[PDB]
């Protein structure tokens, strides 16, 4: 099964304040495992999933120092961004970073990731070759030229291919008691009265992990994009997710309708219909 690791970092300034706040969050296979936040009393990286209390005094200490180093890097960059965009002081601003590595089921590097955004928008990103940069904005060509001239790419390429891949392998052995596991959806259909002679069939999928899931309704073979009603997949808040798709139906005709649930955890898709 493939694997991954990410650090999502952010720095935010507001018009009141003297300094921005910097926050970092680490993820293994998309589950949060570490976090740092400059608003805290004692800013430190903290373990975020039972399996990270393993790392000793040295880990947390050394990662914390890196975090205070990122924070200054982010402070100086906001300041520079403000001038690149000719933004007068008096606004809120955001700079965000995503970094890390995807592994194949063989545990080999599949793809490195380095991307940045400023005010919510793509600012500069490391291309998949880990050699060249994409930066769209006129204002960003400055940064892209400083980074090319300074060999930045070859540095991040080293971290993406070496230290990143390595520490993920390590974190992968350390918690091999959860980190592969998928929870399959349990699905059911509920019956709701609606407009005269018409009811709502609402297919629920519940209890599943990871979040990616597809729900579909058919009228004897024909998929209903016609105005189906779904909700965005949502956290149950116990680590599992929920989704539902509903359709309006002729009253009585409610067995020409089947709900299918597609999910990676499943032996095969579920097939479902209202059952009174």
């Amino acid at each position: 099964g493939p694997h991954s690791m990410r650090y999502f970092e952010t720095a935010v300034s507001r018009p009141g304040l003297e300094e921005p706040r910097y926050i970092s969050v680490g993820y293994v296979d998309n589950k949060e495992f570490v976090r740092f936040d400059s608003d805290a009393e004692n800013p430190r990286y903290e373990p975020r999933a039972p399996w990270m209390e393993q790392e000793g005094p040295e880990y947390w200490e050394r990662e914390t120092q890196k975090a205070k180093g990122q924070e200054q890097w982010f402070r100086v960059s906001l300041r520079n961004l403000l001038g690149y965009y000719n933004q007068s002081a008096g606004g809120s601003h955001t700079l965000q970073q995503m970094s890390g590595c995807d592994l194949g089921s063989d545990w080999r590097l599949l793809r490195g990731y380095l991307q940045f955004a400023y005010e919510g928008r793509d600012y500069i990103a490391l291309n998949e070759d880990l050699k060249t940069w994409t930066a769209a904005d006129m204002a960003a060509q400055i940064t892209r030229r400083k980074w090319e001239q300074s060999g930045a790419a070859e540095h991040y390429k080293a971290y993406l291919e070496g230290e990143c891949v390595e520490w993920l392998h390590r974190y992968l052995k350390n918690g091999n008691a959860t980190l592969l596991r998928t929870d399959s959806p349990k699905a059911h259909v509920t019956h709701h009265p609606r407009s005269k002679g018409e009811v709502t069939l609402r297919c629920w999928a519940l209890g599943f992990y990871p979040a990616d899931i597809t729900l579909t309704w058919q009228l004897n073979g024909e998929e209903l994009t016609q105005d189906m009603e779904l909700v965005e997949t949502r956290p149950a808040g116990d680590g599992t997710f929920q989704k539902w798709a509903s359709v309006v139906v002729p009253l009585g005709k409610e067995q020409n309708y089947t709900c299918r649930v597609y999910h990676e955890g499943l032996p095969e898709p579920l097939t479902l219909r209202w059952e009174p």
Binding site: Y7, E9, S24, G26, E63, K66, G69, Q70, W73, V76, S77, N80, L81, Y84, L95, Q97, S99, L114, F116, Y118, Y123, T143, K146, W147, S150, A152, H155, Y156, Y159, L160, E163, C164, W167
Partner: peptide
């Protein structure tokens, strides 16, 4: 363990 950044913006 997370990247440590190089040249600033």
């Amino acid at each position: 363990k997370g990247p440590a950044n190089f040249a600033t913006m």
